[PDB]
Amino acid sequence: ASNFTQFVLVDNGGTGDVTVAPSNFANGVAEWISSNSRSQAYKVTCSVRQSSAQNRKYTIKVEVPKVATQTVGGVELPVAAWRSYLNMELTIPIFATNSDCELIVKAMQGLLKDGNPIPSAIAANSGIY
Amino acid sequence: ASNFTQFVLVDNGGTGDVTVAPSNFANGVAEWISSNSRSQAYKVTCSVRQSSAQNRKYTIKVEVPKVATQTVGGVELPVAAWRSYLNMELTIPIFATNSDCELIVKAMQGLLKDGNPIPSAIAANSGIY
Amino acid sequence: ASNFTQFVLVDNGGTGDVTVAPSNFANGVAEWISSNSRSQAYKVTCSVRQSSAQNRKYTIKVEVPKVATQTVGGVELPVAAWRSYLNMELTIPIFATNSDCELIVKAMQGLLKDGNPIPSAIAANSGIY
Amino acid sequence: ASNFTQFVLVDNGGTGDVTVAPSNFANGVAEWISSNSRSQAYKVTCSVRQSSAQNRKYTIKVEVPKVATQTVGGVELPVAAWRSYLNMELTIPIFATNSDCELIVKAMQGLLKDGNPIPSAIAANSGIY
Amino acid sequence: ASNFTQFVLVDNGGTGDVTVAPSNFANGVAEWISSNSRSQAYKVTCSVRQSSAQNRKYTIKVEVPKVATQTVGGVELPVAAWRSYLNMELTIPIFATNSDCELIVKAMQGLLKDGNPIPSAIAANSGIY
Amino acid sequence: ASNFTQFVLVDNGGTGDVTVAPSNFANGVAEWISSNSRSQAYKVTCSVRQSSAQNRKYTIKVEVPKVATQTVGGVELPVAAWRSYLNMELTIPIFATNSDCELIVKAMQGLLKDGNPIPSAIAANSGIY
RNA sequence: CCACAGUCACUGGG
RNA sequence: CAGUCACUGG
RNA sequence: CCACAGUCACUGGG
RNA sequence: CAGUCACUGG
């Protein structure tokens, strides 16, 4: 294998797609970013460690830029107003087989499938009701 | 409407599908569970709070169980051999429009699409390289 | 370029091959792990450091597990009945050229070549006689 | 029968071969030494012992010398400018069968096979990258 | 791709060229060295860290050795008579686009072009006047 | 000689070139700047001193303006968001001949040649991977 | 941070 | 030196 | 806040 | 853990 390759983060249907590509590997922490100023980029980082004797833990972080009214290549302050941060921590017991792990991934995919509660709430600046 | 509906967390092609349903909203934490005993159930929770004066934070949790039947005191009980824990926090600035948020949902969806790096590594019990 | 890739640790023909893959590279310690349950996986770690003003030191560690299924209370878990632990330390002075190093590697390879005393002894639960 | 015989430690084709031969076997420590000046010879030692009730432990040591001629006061002496020191410890539980051991040996051989990460790194005065 | 490749540090027209290659990435410090003994090698290291909330800093180091053969204890050893140390730190604001950065690379390249003031002074063991 | 002359810092191929010219010599510290407001200029400074008994040290500093979305002649704040700083310190042992120094310069040129790792990483808002 | 020093991913000084 | 071994104990 | 830990809307550590 | 390493020191 060798999974550290570029990929499509935001699929806008061929036209207007956001691709992120390998940008760093310092400390086993893999990083991908879109072709932008780091202040306006789409960043993705991932790493794995054995958190305890019983578990392994994947830490995945994603940064998404606020695009509405954005000024490409510009200095936008304050940073906190122009960026969204996603922090994911996946804990998997050392007994999990590959199939067990496939199931876990499926569950994650299902959690965010278009039309489901969570993605629907987020995409609508809403909570659950 | 109401976005607090049931949905399928794990899609196995209509046969062996893990569907999860609304089970609680106490203390502002929306909860869903699979049609199982509370000891062997898949659990999904979600909550939104206004973290800072200018941020909103979504806390989503998913628990994937490895179902098993244990024999305690000569008696057989439905239990979970172990559980996988997904913990994700999403911080979005209040200046994010709905389109801005759809961008975030698409990114999260892209992040886990079959074939991409992260889901590949996870399903293979490996890191990125 | 990268030497932190997956490789075949155990060459059992072209089928029962044990392949080990990059898992984590934190704190100067490269770690490879075979696929499936971490609990039953092969592990390989490696690191180099300047042990003294004149010497560089390598520390390689390998774990060979004896795969087994543990059952307790009627619950089956993939585990390792036990593990064989290989721990080696290689010290090389900074005056060693690439040729000198190639020589060192050859000696290591020869020491373990099929037919030779040490490997023969080990493979037969034996010592020297 | 005897496995305490001479063998080729360094296979440099069929000429510049470094052969090491039995030298002494006192106190459970088998020792091999290449021919000529002891001062410039290759050394290999090996021993097994029951380290615990459950484990047997092997201790292999190898010395690769950098041949050189020292001159002092006009007196020439064959010496070793410096020496590379390999020290390995292999622990194997008493439940290991001959098959289990053969497997362990294969893993050791694979770890050092030409082309693989560890040997490549060592042979190039390099680490992992 | 992967930008961690070998390159020629000193171009002497294909004959007497000093080429340097990846040798380590431990602790997030990318390292390259020339095909020499660690004691006589050319060394290049590079690292990026997010210095401030809005800055990123590249730390690049280059070590140019003056190779020599010293006689210590009547024995001859490959050593370095002395070393020249280049230490450079580049701080770039996160608002810099890729074009902004290309500008920086072009400037650094221009700074050292044959004929220009700085490289002229350095090569002549003189200051600017 | 007399190397304190104007030169092309950024070579954009005849059209759109950035030239810097002598602007100060206070304290032996030579300075060049582009024809801009000092807040938006390209600045280059260089100086030499004998740092110790064994070494001489060249301190070279370069400042590059962020051009994307820049407003020529305008007041851009905060300064830190609009500027990149390069700090170079070159240490050369007093034994270095002119030829030794030419080699050092070549190594610097090679380090930053178009297409090589470092310049490629910088120009792409990336690290090494 | 330093036109601070060194034997330089380390050490020492402002 | 010992251990289910980048960790612990002598 | 943490590529902090867990038995995980709870507990413990920076 | 370190060392010209079945030995020594932490």
mmCIF file with all atom_site columns, C-alpha atoms in Angstrom, chain A residues 36-128:
data_model
loop_
_atom_site.group_PDB
_atom_site.id
_atom_site.type_symbol
_atom_site.label_atom_id
_atom_site.label_alt_id
_atom_site.label_comp_id
_atom_site.label_asym_id
_atom_site.label_entity_id
_atom_site.label_seq_id
_atom_site.pdbx_PDB_ins_code
_atom_site.Cartn_x
_atom_site.Cartn_y
_atom_site.Cartn_z
_atom_site.occupancy
_atom_site.B_iso_or_equiv
_atom_site.pdbx_formal_charge
_atom_site.auth_seq_id
_atom_site.auth_comp_id
_atom_site.auth_asym_id
_atom_site.auth_atom_id
_atom_site.pdbx_PDB_model_num
ATOM 1  C CA . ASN A 1 36  ? -4.160  28.136 -0.348 1.00 0.00 ? 36  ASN A CA 1
ATOM 2  C CA . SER A 1 37  ? -2.499  30.435 2.128  1.00 0.00 ? 37  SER A CA 1
ATOM 3  C CA . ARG A 1 38  ? -2.292  28.431 5.333  1.00 0.00 ? 38  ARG A CA 1
ATOM 4  C CA . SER A 1 39  ? -4.702  30.948 6.819  1.00 0.00 ? 39  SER A CA 1
ATOM 5  C CA . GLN A 1 40  ? -7.367  30.046 4.242  1.00 0.00 ? 40  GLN A CA 1
ATOM 6  C CA . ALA A 1 41  ? -6.507  26.404 3.594  1.00 0.00 ? 41  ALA A CA 1
ATOM 7  C CA . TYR A 1 42  ? -8.404  23.202 4.205  1.00 0.00 ? 42  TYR A CA 1
ATOM 8  C CA . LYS A 1 43  ? -6.206  21.201 6.535  1.00 0.00 ? 43  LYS A CA 1
ATOM 9  C CA . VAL A 1 44  ? -6.408  17.562 7.496  1.00 0.00 ? 44  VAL A CA 1
ATOM 10 C CA . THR A 1 45  ? -4.127  15.759 9.944  1.00 0.00 ? 45  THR A CA 1
ATOM 11 C CA . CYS A 1 46  ? -4.192  12.207 11.214 1.00 0.00 ? 46  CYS A CA 1
ATOM 12 C CA . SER A 1 47  ? -2.148  10.098 13.629 1.00 0.00 ? 47  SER A CA 1
ATOM 13 C CA . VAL A 1 48  ? -2.312  6.773  15.488 1.00 0.00 ? 48  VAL A CA 1
ATOM 14 C CA . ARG A 1 49  ? -0.973  5.773  18.860 1.00 0.00 ? 49  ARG A CA 1
ATOM 15 C CA . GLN A 1 50  ? -1.544  3.051  21.411 1.00 0.00 ? 50  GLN A CA 1
ATOM 16 C CA . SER A 1 51  ? -3.292  5.132  24.101 1.00 0.00 ? 51  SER A CA 1
ATOM 17 C CA . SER A 1 52  ? -3.313  2.354  26.683 1.00 0.00 ? 52  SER A CA 1
ATOM 18 C CA . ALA A 1 53  ? -2.736  -1.384 27.042 1.00 0.00 ? 53  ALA A CA 1
ATOM 19 C CA . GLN A 1 54  ? -6.269  -2.075 25.851 1.00 0.00 ? 54  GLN A CA 1
ATOM 20 C CA . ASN A 1 55  ? -6.754  0.589  23.196 1.00 0.00 ? 55  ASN A CA 1
ATOM 21 C CA . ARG A 1 56  ? -5.373  2.221  20.086 1.00 0.00 ? 56  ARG A CA 1
ATOM 22 C CA . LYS A 1 57  ? -6.442  5.772  19.272 1.00 0.00 ? 57  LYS A CA 1
ATOM 23 C CA . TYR A 1 58  ? -6.764  7.641  15.978 1.00 0.00 ? 58  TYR A CA 1
ATOM 24 C CA . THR A 1 59  ? -6.688  11.410 16.296 1.00 0.00 ? 59  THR A CA 1
ATOM 25 C CA . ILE A 1 60  ? -8.055  13.162 13.212 1.00 0.00 ? 60  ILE A CA 1
ATOM 26 C CA . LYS A 1 61  ? -8.291  16.925 12.886 1.00 0.00 ? 61  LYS A CA 1
ATOM 27 C CA . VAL A 1 62  ? -9.827  18.989 10.102 1.00 0.00 ? 62  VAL A CA 1
ATOM 28 C CA . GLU A 1 63  ? -9.882  22.731 9.505  1.00 0.00 ? 63  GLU A CA 1
ATOM 29 C CA . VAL A 1 64  ? -12.437 24.275 7.143  1.00 0.00 ? 64  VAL A CA 1
ATOM 30 C CA . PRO A 1 65  ? -12.304 27.903 5.946  1.00 0.00 ? 65  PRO A CA 1
ATOM 31 C CA . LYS A 1 66  ? -15.309 30.233 6.077  1.00 0.00 ? 66  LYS A CA 1
ATOM 32 C CA . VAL A 1 67  ? -15.875 31.025 2.402  1.00 0.00 ? 67  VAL A CA 1
ATOM 33 C CA . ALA A 1 68  ? -18.832 33.432 2.360  1.00 0.00 ? 68  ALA A CA 1
ATOM 34 C CA . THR A 1 69  ? -17.469 36.973 1.753  1.00 0.00 ? 69  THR A CA 1
ATOM 35 C CA . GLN A 1 70  ? -13.913 35.636 1.900  1.00 0.00 ? 70  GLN A CA 1
ATOM 36 C CA . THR A 1 71  ? -11.155 37.652 0.182  1.00 0.00 ? 71  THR A CA 1
ATOM 37 C CA . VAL A 1 72  ? -8.823  35.146 -1.468 1.00 0.00 ? 72  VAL A CA 1
ATOM 38 C CA . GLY A 1 73  ? -5.209  35.621 -0.450 1.00 0.00 ? 73  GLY A CA 1
ATOM 39 C CA . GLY A 1 74  ? -6.171  38.326 1.988  1.00 0.00 ? 74  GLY A CA 1
ATOM 40 C CA . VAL A 1 75  ? -5.438  38.924 5.645  1.00 0.00 ? 75  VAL A CA 1
ATOM 41 C CA . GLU A 1 76  ? -8.626  38.054 7.517  1.00 0.00 ? 76  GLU A CA 1
ATOM 42 C CA . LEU A 1 77  ? -8.759  38.764 11.235 1.00 0.00 ? 77  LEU A CA 1
ATOM 43 C CA . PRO A 1 78  ? -9.695  37.546 13.711 1.00 0.00 ? 78  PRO A CA 1
ATOM 44 C CA . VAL A 1 79  ? -8.715  34.023 12.691 1.00 0.00 ? 79  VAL A CA 1
ATOM 45 C CA . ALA A 1 80  ? -11.363 32.532 14.948 1.00 0.00 ? 80  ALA A CA 1
ATOM 46 C CA . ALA A 1 81  ? -14.109 34.176 12.880 1.00 0.00 ? 81  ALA A CA 1
ATOM 47 C CA . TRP A 1 82  ? -12.919 32.646 9.660  1.00 0.00 ? 82  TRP A CA 1
ATOM 48 C CA . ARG A 1 83  ? -12.323 29.044 10.609 1.00 0.00 ? 83  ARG A CA 1
ATOM 49 C CA . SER A 1 84  ? -14.106 25.909 11.738 1.00 0.00 ? 84  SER A CA 1
ATOM 50 C CA . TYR A 1 85  ? -12.327 23.151 13.646 1.00 0.00 ? 85  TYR A CA 1
ATOM 51 C CA . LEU A 1 86  ? -13.199 19.480 13.696 1.00 0.00 ? 86  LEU A CA 1
ATOM 52 C CA . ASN A 1 87  ? -11.493 17.263 16.239 1.00 0.00 ? 87  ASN A CA 1
ATOM 53 C CA . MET A 1 88  ? -12.082 13.497 16.047 1.00 0.00 ? 88  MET A CA 1
ATOM 54 C CA . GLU A 1 89  ? -10.733 10.893 18.420 1.00 0.00 ? 89  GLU A CA 1
ATOM 55 C CA . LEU A 1 90  ? -11.446 7.253  17.611 1.00 0.00 ? 90  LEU A CA 1
ATOM 56 C CA . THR A 1 91  ? -10.660 4.683  20.298 1.00 0.00 ? 91  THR A CA 1
ATOM 57 C CA . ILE A 1 92  ? -10.440 1.076  19.180 1.00 0.00 ? 92  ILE A CA 1
ATOM 58 C CA . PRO A 1 93  ? -9.775  -1.877 21.538 1.00 0.00 ? 93  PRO A CA 1
ATOM 59 C CA . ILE A 1 94  ? -6.745  -3.958 20.499 1.00 0.00 ? 94  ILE A CA 1
ATOM 60 C CA . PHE A 1 95  ? -9.042  -6.926 19.895 1.00 0.00 ? 95  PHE A CA 1
ATOM 61 C CA . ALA A 1 96  ? -10.706 -5.298 16.906 1.00 0.00 ? 96  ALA A CA 1
ATOM 62 C CA . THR A 1 97  ? -10.088 -7.266 13.745 1.00 0.00 ? 97  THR A CA 1
ATOM 63 C CA . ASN A 1 98  ? -9.989  -5.660 10.315 1.00 0.00 ? 98  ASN A CA 1
ATOM 64 C CA . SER A 1 99  ? -13.657 -6.540 9.790  1.00 0.00 ? 99  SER A CA 1
ATOM 65 C CA . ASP A 1 100 ? -14.533 -5.049 13.159 1.00 0.00 ? 100 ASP A CA 1
ATOM 66 C CA . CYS A 1 101 ? -12.764 -1.891 11.960 1.00 0.00 ? 101 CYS A CA 1
ATOM 67 C CA . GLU A 1 102 ? -14.591 -1.875 8.646  1.00 0.00 ? 102 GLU A CA 1
ATOM 68 C CA . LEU A 1 103 ? -17.840 -1.842 10.602 1.00 0.00 ? 103 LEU A CA 1
ATOM 69 C CA . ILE A 1 104 ? -16.619 1.085  12.695 1.00 0.00 ? 104 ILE A CA 1
ATOM 70 C CA . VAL A 1 105 ? -15.792 3.031  9.551  1.00 0.00 ? 105 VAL A CA 1
ATOM 71 C CA . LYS A 1 106 ? -19.235 2.235  8.114  1.00 0.00 ? 106 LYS A CA 1
ATOM 72 C CA . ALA A 1 107 ? -20.871 3.563  11.277 1.00 0.00 ? 107 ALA A CA 1
ATOM 73 C CA . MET A 1 108 ? -18.931 6.800  10.857 1.00 0.00 ? 108 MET A CA 1
ATOM 74 C CA . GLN A 1 109 ? -20.006 7.053  7.241  1.00 0.00 ? 109 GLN A CA 1
ATOM 75 C CA . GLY A 1 110 ? -23.605 6.437  8.238  1.00 0.00 ? 110 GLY A CA 1
ATOM 76 C CA . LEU A 1 111 ? -23.491 9.010  11.005 1.00 0.00 ? 111 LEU A CA 1
ATOM 77 C CA . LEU A 1 112 ? -22.727 11.694 8.397  1.00 0.00 ? 112 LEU A CA 1
ATOM 78 C CA . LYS A 1 113 ? -24.609 10.436 5.330  1.00 0.00 ? 113 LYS A CA 1
ATOM 79 C CA . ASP A 1 114 ? -26.548 13.154 3.506  1.00 0.00 ? 114 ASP A CA 1
ATOM 80 C CA . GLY A 1 115 ? -30.056 13.525 4.863  1.00 0.00 ? 115 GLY A CA 1
ATOM 81 C CA . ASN A 1 116 ? -29.329 12.118 8.297  1.00 0.00 ? 116 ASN A CA 1
ATOM 82 C CA . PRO A 1 117 ? -29.990 14.075 11.511 1.00 0.00 ? 117 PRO A CA 1
ATOM 83 C CA . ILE A 1 118 ? -26.476 15.247 12.447 1.00 0.00 ? 118 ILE A CA 1
ATOM 84 C CA . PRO A 1 119 ? -25.295 16.490 9.045  1.00 0.00 ? 119 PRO A CA 1
ATOM 85 C CA . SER A 1 120 ? -28.708 18.055 8.523  1.00 0.00 ? 120 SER A CA 1
ATOM 86 C CA . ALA A 1 121 ? -28.565 19.957 11.788 1.00 0.00 ? 121 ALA A CA 1
ATOM 87 C CA . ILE A 1 122 ? -25.028 21.191 11.219 1.00 0.00 ? 122 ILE A CA 1
ATOM 88 C CA . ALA A 1 123 ? -25.672 22.269 7.653  1.00 0.00 ? 123 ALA A CA 1
ATOM 89 C CA . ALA A 1 124 ? -28.629 24.280 8.906  1.00 0.00 ? 124 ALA A CA 1
ATOM 90 C CA . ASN A 1 125 ? -26.970 26.087 11.800 1.00 0.00 ? 125 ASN A CA 1
ATOM 91 C CA . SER A 1 126 ? -29.286 24.080 14.055 1.00 0.00 ? 126 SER A CA 1
ATOM 92 C CA . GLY A 1 127 ? -29.456 21.691 16.949 1.00 0.00 ? 127 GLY A CA 1
ATOM 93 C CA . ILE A 1 128 ? -31.839 18.765 17.391 1.00 0.00 ? 128 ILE A CA 1
#
